[PDB]
Amino acid sequence: HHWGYGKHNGPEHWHKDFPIAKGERQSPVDIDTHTAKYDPSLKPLSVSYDQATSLRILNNGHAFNVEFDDSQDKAVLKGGPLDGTYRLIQFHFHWGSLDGQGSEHTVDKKKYAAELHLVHWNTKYGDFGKAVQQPDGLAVLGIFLKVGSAKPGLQKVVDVLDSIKTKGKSADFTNFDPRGLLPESLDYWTYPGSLTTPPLLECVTWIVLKEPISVSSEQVLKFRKLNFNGEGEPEELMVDNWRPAQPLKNRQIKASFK
Ligand SMILES: NS(=O)(=O)c1cc(C(=O)NCCO)c(SC2CCCCC2)cc1Cl
Numbered sequence: 408h409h410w411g412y413g414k415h416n417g418p419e420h421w422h423k424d425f426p427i428a429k430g431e432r433q434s435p436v437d438i439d440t441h442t443a444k445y446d447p448s449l450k451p452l453s454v455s456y457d458q459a460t461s462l463r464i465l466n467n468g469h470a471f472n473v474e475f476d477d478s479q480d481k482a483v484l485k486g487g488p489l490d491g492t493y494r495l496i497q498f499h500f501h502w503g504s505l506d507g508q509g510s511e512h513t514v515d516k517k518k519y520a521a522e523l524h525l526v527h528w529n530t531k532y533g534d535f536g537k538a539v540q541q542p543d544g545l546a547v548l549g550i551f552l553k554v555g556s557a558k559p560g561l562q563k564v565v566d567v568l569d570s571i572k573t574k575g576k577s578a579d580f581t582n583f584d585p586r587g588l589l590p591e592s593l594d595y596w597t598y599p600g601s602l603t604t605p606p607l608l609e610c611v612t613w614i615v616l617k618e619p620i621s622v623s624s625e626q627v628l629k630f631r632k633l634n635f636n637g638e639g640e641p642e643e644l645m646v647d648n649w650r651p652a653q654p655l656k657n658r659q660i661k662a663s664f665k
């Protein structure tokens with residue numbers, strides 16, 4: 408039946424329902440750090456999350472989303488490679504069954520334990536659903552996670568996961584500050600790509616930070632206790648919910664640094 412990450416419905420099957428899976432600007436990609444060229448014309452990124460209003464956390468059967476009120480200009484991304492203003496709508500993660508895999512992007516073929524995606528939509532198109540129909544509709548800030556020291560700012564998310572164990576469960580999640588998930592440096596790579604989940608639309612400017620954040624083994628172990636299945640169905644741990652790297656094709660990855 409429906410797409411997922413399992414034995415029979417995972418990434419290698421998605422093209423049959425979503426032929427753009429084999430398109431010309433698919434994500435994620437391996438970032439070859441020696442080939443990415445420093446681009447002096449990029450700007451510092453502007454991440455303005457001071458007025459971010461979180462509302463709720465949802466297990467959607469693929470990952471979990473932390474949702475924001477995007478009905479006004481509050482939490483916005485701009486600058487860097489972007490023109491105009493992009494509003495935060497949600498964040499989620501991809502992660503592995505073991506610490507040696509889980510990220511979607513890779514760096515010189517290195518896999519991180521997990522990757523955080525902060526999803527934003529371009530306010531010139533009025534709403535998220537119109538934005539995903541445009542080549543410059545979305546901007547995703549991607550952040551790698553390695554296992555080491557705990558990330559204090561992640562603990563509020565970790566502790567609510569037992570309340571949204573299974574697909575379709577949600578919980579109130581107000582007053583969460585996403586600034587606590589950022590690394591110290593905003594040095595980044597950028598390229599034109601796609602959603603990494605069906606429908607795989609080619610509507611995303613990717614901005615991938617170079618500096619990972621560190622989370623503890625105990626924090627990532629709580630992610631791995633979530634379930635892909637619904638309540639009362641046989642348990643399928645939510646692990647390995649990442650799409651592998653796709654062909655770069657006719658694209659350049661640009662560096663904001665060096
Ligand atoms: N992994 S990613 O490329 O950052 C990305 C993921 C999703 C997303 O939440 N996917 C889960 C299955 O729908 C969404 S929202 C989703 C996709 C379009 C229709 C609305 C649901 C947007 C992005 Cl950019």
Ligand SMILES: [Zn+2]
Nearest residue numbers: 500501524603
């Ligand atoms: Zn994602």
